[PDB]
Design a protein around this ligand. Structure first.
Ligand code: CFM
Ligand code: CFM
Ligand code: CLF
Ligand code: CLF
Ligand SMILES: [Ca+2]
Ligand SMILES: [Ca+2]
Lengths: 522, 467, 522, 468
């Protein structure tokens, strides 16, 4: 029943006695449910070190992964160029999923097309799909460029994207000069980040390779910045802000921050901002190219060095105090621009926040996950804060990365309790936060189910989630935040000290019980 | 209306290359339409794939079984906890619905086949999740293309472990949308689960046993349906898929009537239980007071005098409640016009709920419906309202710009487009994280939600005072 | 007992058995405590409507006030001028307290002096204190200006600030031309915001009252901005940001944002930034003066209008969508500057966030408090978000203000269940959240004691506090936030939606009980 | 040593005008010093007022009474929940420490007096807070200046309601610091509370009844002290102020010995209890292992052979624990130098605790100490170290620039100055929201806190690498 002035949604409606009875009748009468005591027994068993031993021996089963597939990244790369349509050659189900996954994180339109390969194409190839697909998209959606990617179907049947695009130009489906860069992005090799790298390499090769004979490294006097898979608007924005502050000429190659944040003013804008084709053509003429997230940009590095002849600096992701410092000094070096007074002040205001908050941050234990570059920067910054990154998980990380992070850990007293896990997933991490309980997890929204599991063992075992990463679906607008630069470090510090203090206030809110320590001032 | 809608359709189609123009022309009608054909490449269809229809919608809701997204990591990651098919359970112990189990195919599995890997992970699932009551492997695109035989592995391992293991070949390249996935999934239930209790005389049936077929419990929708039928003296032996258990399905052959809400996704299995067990099925609608009342009436008429009277009691009980709802909200929603675009049922099924709030549906369409769904739709819409099957992004945007509906109801990929154009939008798949919308209790939440969005202060502020 | 590897601070140390025992004995023998059942009985009585009616009849007792005294405001006003030392003439206890209160909010040094009047000065006046005080302060701390306010001892004994400063100049203790503005600031009249008003009008008068003959209203073609008592660094910052990107020439009069945020770089800077004496002298030449917080800048308005002859625009505090629009357009009008495309976009991005988050914000009930301009702006934005400002308390609000706000409420269906309370305090508010429970309180850290009380009555009666206001002492670095403009609106909207969703996730984190609605996507 | 420090003192003093220079020279010494005199105007004293000493420190901790900050709104507001004097109770019904009760004077009360308003609010306190055990009215600056008589209001209304109402004349203009507030507060206890049980024979005293005088339970400090005393066999009948109840204070007339932790605030009422009741009092220290050991023994010595065995039991019973703490933390803190500046006890009382972790206190001083406290300090401080009474802002900054200490221990108005200078700072009044620091359990926390801050990674980061 409903009372029309206090209508109840599913929670708390189904807590009403009649619903509670009906659901009890349903299980007892028809579900043949395992008895609660057996359930409790198995739940306690899944928190043990024994379950953990067995869990970590898995070879074939993956449960709750912390990565997605290559074309998801390829679409995000494509979206950063001026008026281009991401196009994924293969089965359409994939595009409906890529679009929805980013729609949920940015709360924005995400435009992308498929060329709907069906059963028949699986036997005869998808050539006609490319032909009609390109023509239809160019006519209906009017992009200045189409960036072609691939689904696993089109990968397994081995469709030569290059031949098909050339044959579509040959047959007059799209004009010969229309930009159609491509990349093969197989979901069974690496992850979403690899798709971003493959796609960017594809686009850079397309505007540059057969034009190198007139490019003079340095004549436009700019530095190129390649962001990598990036899902925080504040990160694209802070890198541009810092370089403009230094008077440094730059080219942010693949910049989606306008299309991922259009105004609600009475009209929908399908395309907005982005890197222009002219910037991509001129990008050899830059002094150098900096890769903001180098561990998933290896193919782009090989291409920028090998063909553009740029000596890509050995820079880590500009996350935390030290690595934002190194970034700024290398930019200074390359451009001959001095690091301005404003950035020196900003650096010191971050250092000031560190001195003010260090007592609550000291020795706090964290479990965390995400993409390789994001994770290593968060590890670095946690060590700088005097915290312990005890469980560092990166499902899609590789052996050399793992070595680089264990090195960073070995260089600090605060790394002594930490272990790096590559190829492991969130059900693996679930074990680790029960058997070697940290204080908090820093992760994406899938972490909420691990927090729910720890709370079921009991309040003293609950490990709270701090949502930093991708995807964040159960909170609004956190995609606007920053994790890079001194700005991003200020935001992360504030979020960590205040998660600690909120949790401390929840534990000391017991009247006459724990509220002796429920301090007004902290 | 009349030829304004007709000229609007040819206006929009003018942008297409001729092949696309000729095809799309057959998929747009004024209330005459062809459906369940393939999508034209590059036109930004809103459709999903057969995997979405099998794993995402039919098997995924089954509470106590583990479902393996078999193939690469993408498919099962993007579908992880995306549909709100609600359930009561201890997740990771006896229930597993929000978890993502996958075989995470890497290149060696593509080159040499994942059947060996499938057998290994079935053992792993058995050590680590001992309270699971069955497994289903949902094939992603590579599995068929690669030539694996998940059936052999399912029989062998099922045999060995005395475990119900269902192979489902719902690879995304099959069919033209998630519709064929419903059919593959119904046939996999048929072949591997539904017959298991055929010799069991042991279930004490009563004359009033019924099963809810095709309600996936979005936001609790099946629970607010179940309670009404139960109050009307019927016993629901099974709930198909939403909060469903495998035993409920194996027990569904013992009921007296199959009540079909979602015709499109489950008419296949209903026709089969009719042929094999003699069980009759009937369609019903539980969106809004009018439809819920005539459905309770029609279902009650299928039984004996007591049930007809309990039906009249139930109707009399909720009368003050749904009437207070319409009294508060219909004067707020009166005469507002809605355009809808959803999947295979709700585009026709929610019209009555809107009319109970004095609203009119000026356009509706389906992603993957077939012609028997449109025959059913025409009975519900006004003359001259717009009908669009597998609408392109472009067409929908253009139709909306012309018709200027006061509210649009569709999915997550459409939401933010129309909100930037200033049109009130409500998600009619996930209920915009609200709901249930089924039954009498669901009507109160539906009424409240349509009101809060259509009449929200934010819509007056889209244009700056200076331009 | 302590484990050297796991040392327990107060919480959890005193939960250890031997301490639990030890405190039990201490109570029962010696404390002569009322029995727990009586305690519980009285507690339920304080949650009732009965108790509320008696509580609201208080004429003489104030319990948990939501205002501070005048000189605190004057100190904050004074710290906004270039190299100025705040000086409170009267007793030193007050200065120790003013400095500590701001130290705790800003986590920064707060420099202020006293001239330390004692019992002796109560019989003979504080002239010598002012003489030696000014001289000593000027030589020791080397300010370019000393801005004088008063404590209640000096007010009650009636020391003539003007004569005392003039006699210090006459008697040679400070140069005749050393800047010493003053303002009398009685703690028994008004509140801290009144102290800021008085101090600002004093410094304004000091620099302009004589020089008026060469002043041409408009000749320097700048607009003056008077901020009022402001404790969010982001607010000073966003006003400057918006005016600069609009190309509007302006003068922020009293600007503390550098002194309240110096870098931790090895040096302590006593003074930093601030409005120059030159700006205060040139200020009559501005086109007009905009008052950012009009309801506590009455004396300043009378002086800016009556002596500088500026027609002060009737603008409300720029909080919420409409009042930031009205602000930018009035500024456009006076400056002849168009509102740039970047600010139009930002407005639209805020409206976009409003459309994405409205279904969670709709109809949410709030109890709220703070200073008059802050509270009405928060009310205005809550109504624009579709929320209901059910309990609006402003201890230092006045009858004309309560009318203005009731008129804002009257113009919205969302204002229908809201009541404004002036002259009421937080123990009054404690009863209102018991008897007419809202969903959240938006307030400063004193609200944590109300949340602890509501929690004690039961989990379903707990009203969570959302920290926005002054002072915030139990969280770190929230003084860096913004509440004004589109930026401030974006931050408040994100804090509100997300506090709603965090509350929903803790309520649905019950395994097989409430977690049917513990959705990944919201 | 000597010449270096004397040169420092004279150099610093040369910024002053002569009157101020001559006075400040008298308050700076190398170990000769004067204390408890007025602060020179305009020099940014760190001191507070007599109200802070009475409401903030002595009365405010007493949990079951309501303490009225009588006068304008400022004083009570800035002191609400600022001091972490911990208590067990249901706040707002039976306990009231974190609340701010005030008569909020407006102009009509200054011009006509607030005595009728005090009477009306005592009635209201009685309506809305029935389970309160007494009321004290802490006068702020205006009450005495305007000629009010809060004593008549207290005994009239107190008589009229059978409730203890204590009038306290701790107006901020009285004295030169928080110090006189302690004394005014000690006399207010003596005159309106301490004599109430004088005709009562109902309390069964034992040869081992004791009371802790002057432990305000900052962060639980009294609780970590008490436990050790009762584990030694003694019974603590009262805790003065920290988690204090009025009945505990009324029962203090029956104890055998008064254990004075804070001499400066409590000595006044102790000397009185000795004169009027023969109860002896002794001073102790419960900061660091050495001092707590020395103290438990001194207290036990004054009782007999059983308690002396139990004292030696307790000492063995914690020797594992504190020895583990020094083993862990002393190598990390060895030879690091601390400069301190706190109120009137802690500047000398924590020296040994620092030394137990091998640190040297190279400077210490007090806000409001008197010469007898400095007598006590020179025994604890090293030869040639720096002493400063009522240091000015300027002086403390300049002393630190030249002494270059490795850690500074002082208050909240000093904290952020020295952190910007790159020097580790710990708050030695609020314990930087950590603690207890008393007893052996307190020693553990103290040791962790000094190390986490002195050895924090952030101190290596104050200089930007491009400005190296
Ligand atoms: S889009 Fe139902 S045929 Fe199917 S997931 Fe939605 S309109 Fe589906 S009613 Fe159902 S619960 Fe659905 S809402 Fe039939 S199940 S493939 Mo997207
Ligand atoms: S500054 Fe104690 S004489 Fe008094 S509040 Fe601190 S050094 Fe006081 S030990 Fe104590 S609890 Fe104190 S820390 Fe005597 S009580 S007026 Mo500021
Ligand atoms: S149509 Fe459907 S969702 Fe598409 S893949 Fe095919 S079954 Fe699946 Fe999968 S992993 Fe990624 S999302 Fe694709 S490219 Fe392969
Ligand atoms: S020395 Fe001490 S703190 Fe000062 S006033 Fe006097 S008792 Fe009090 Fe009070 S209200 Fe404000 S803070 Fe003062 S100006 Fe009056
Ligand atoms: Ca959006
Ligand atoms: Ca600071």
């Amino acid at each position: 029943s409903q009372q029309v002035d206090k209508i109840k949604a599913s929670y708390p409606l189904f807590l009403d006695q009649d619903y509670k009875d009906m659901l009890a009748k349903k299980r007892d009468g028809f579900e043949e449910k395992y008895p609660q005591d057996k359930i409790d027994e198995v739940f306690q068993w899944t928190t043990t070190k024994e379950y953990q031993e067995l869990n970590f021996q898995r070879e074939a089963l993956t449960v709750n992964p912390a990565k997605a597939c290559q074309p998801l990244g390829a679409v995000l790369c494509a979206l950063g160029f001026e008026k281009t349509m991401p196009y994924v050659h293969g089965s359409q189900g994939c595009v409906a999923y890529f679009r929805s996954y980013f729609n949920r994180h940015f709360r924005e339109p995400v435009s992308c097309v498929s060329d709907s390969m069906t059963e028949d194409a699986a036997v005869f190839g998808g050539q006609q799909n490319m032909k009609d697909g390109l023509q239809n998209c160019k006519a209906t959606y009017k992009p200045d460029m189409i960036a072609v990617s691939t689904t696993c179907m089109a990968e397994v049947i081995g469709d030569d994207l290059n031949a098909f695009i050339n044959n579509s130009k040959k047959e007059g489906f799209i004009p010969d000069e229309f930009p159609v860069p491509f990349a093969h992005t197989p979901s069974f090799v690496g992850s979403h980040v690899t798709g971003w790298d493959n796609m960017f390499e594809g686009i850079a090769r397309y505007f540059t390779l057969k034009s190198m004979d007139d490019k003079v490294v340095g004549s436009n006097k700019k530095i190129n910045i390649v962001p990598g898979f990036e899902t925080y608007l504040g990160n694209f924005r802070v890198i541009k802000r810092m370089l403009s502050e230094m008077g440094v000429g730059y080219s942010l190659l693949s910049d989606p921050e306008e299309v991922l944040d259009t105004p609600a003013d009475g009209q929908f804008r399908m395309y907005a901002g982005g890197t222009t084709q002219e910037e991509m053509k001129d990008a050899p003429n830059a002094l150098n190219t900096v890769l903001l997230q180098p561990w998933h940009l290896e193919k782009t590095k090989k291409f920028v060095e090998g063909t553009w002849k740029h000596e890509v600096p050995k820079l880590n992701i500009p996350m935390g105090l030290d690595w934002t410092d190194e970034f700024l000094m290398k930019v200074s070096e390359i451009s001959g621009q001095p690091i301005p007074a404003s950035l020196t002040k900003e650096r010191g205001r971050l250092v000031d926040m560190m001195t003010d908050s260090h007592t609550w941050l000291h020795g706090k234990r964290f479990a965390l996950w995400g993409d390789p570059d994001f994770v290593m920067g968060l590890v670095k910054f946690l060590l700088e804060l005097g915290c312990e990154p005890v469980h560092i998980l990166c499902h899609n990380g590789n052996k050399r990365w793992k070595k680089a992070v264990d090195a960073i850990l070995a260089a600090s007293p605060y790394g002594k309790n930490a272990t790096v896990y590559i190829g492991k997933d969130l059900w693996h991490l679930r074990s680790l936060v029960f058997t070697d309980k940290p204080d908090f997890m820093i992760g994406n929204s899938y972490g909420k189910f691990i927090q729910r599991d720890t709370l079921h063992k009991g309040k003293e075992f609950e490990v709270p989630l701090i949502r930093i990463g991708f995807p964040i679906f159960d909170r609004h607008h956190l995609h606007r935040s920053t994790t890079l630069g001194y700005e991003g470090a200020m935001q992360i510090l504030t979020t960590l000290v205040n998660s600690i203090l909120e949790r401390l206030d929840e534990e000391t809110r017991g009247m006459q019980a724990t509220d002796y320590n429920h301090d007004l001032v902290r | 209306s009349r030829e304004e809608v007709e000229s609007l359709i040819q206006e929009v189609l003018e942008v297409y290359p001729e092949k696309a123009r000729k095809d799309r022309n057959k998929h747009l009608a004024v209330n005459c339409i062809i459906s369940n054909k393939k999508s034209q490449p590059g036109l930004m269809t809103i459709r999903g794939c057969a995997y979405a229809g099998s794993k995402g919608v039919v098997w995924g809701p089954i509470k106590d079984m583990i479902h393996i997204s078999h193939g690469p990591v993408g498919c099962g990651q993007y579908s992880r906890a995306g549909r709100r098919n609600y359930y009561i359970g201890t997740t990771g112990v006896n229930a597993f619905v929000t978890m993502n189990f996958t075989s995470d195919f890497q290149e060696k599995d593509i080159v040499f086949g994942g059947d060996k890997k499938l057998a290994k992970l079935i053992d792993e699932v058995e050590t680590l999740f001992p309270l699971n009551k069955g497994i289903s492997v949902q094939s992603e695109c590579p599995i068929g293309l690669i030539g694996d035989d998940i059936e052999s592995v399912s029989k062998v391992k099922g045999a060995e472990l005395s475990k119900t293991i269902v192979p489902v070949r719902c690879e995304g390249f099959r069919g033209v949308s998630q519709s064929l996935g419903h059919h593959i999934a119904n046939d996999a239930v048929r072949d591997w689960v539904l017959g298991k209790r055929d010799e069991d005389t042991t279930f004490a049936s009563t004359p009033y046993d019924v099963a809810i077929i095709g309600d996936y419990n979005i936001g609790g929708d099946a629970w607010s349906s179940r309670i009404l039928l139960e109050e009307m003296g019927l016993r629901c032996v099974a709930q198909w898929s939403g909060d469903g258990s495998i035993s409920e399905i194996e027990l569904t052959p013992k009921v007296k009537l199959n009540l079909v809400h979602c015709y499109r996704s489950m008419n296949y299995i209903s026709r089969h239980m009719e042929e094999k067990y003699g069980i009759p099925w009937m369609e019903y609608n539980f969106f809004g007071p009018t439809k819920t009342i005539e459905s309770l009436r029609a279902i009650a008429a299928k039984f004996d005098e007591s049930i007809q009277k309990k039906c009249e009691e139930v109707i009399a009980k909720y009368k003050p409640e749904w009437e207070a709802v319409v009294a508060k909200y219909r004067p707020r929603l009166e005469g507002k016009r809605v355009m809808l675009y959803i999947g295979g049922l709700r585009p026709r099924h929610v019209i009555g709920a809107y009319e109970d709030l004095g609203m009119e549906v000026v356009g509706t369409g389906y992603e993957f419906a077939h012609n028997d769904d449109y025959d059913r739709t025409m009975k519900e819409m006004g003359d001259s309202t717009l009908l669009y099957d597998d609408v392109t992004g472009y067409e929908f945007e253009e139709f909306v710009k012309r018709i200027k509906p006061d509210l649009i109801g569709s999915g997550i990929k459409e939401k933010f487009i129309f909100q930037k154009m200033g049109i009130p939008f409500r998600e009619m798949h996930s209920w915009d994280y609200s709901g249930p919308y089924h039954g009498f209790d669901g009507f109160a939440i539906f009424a409240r939600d349509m009101d809060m969005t259509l009449n929200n202060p934010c819509w007056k502020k889209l244009q700056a005072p200076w331009e």
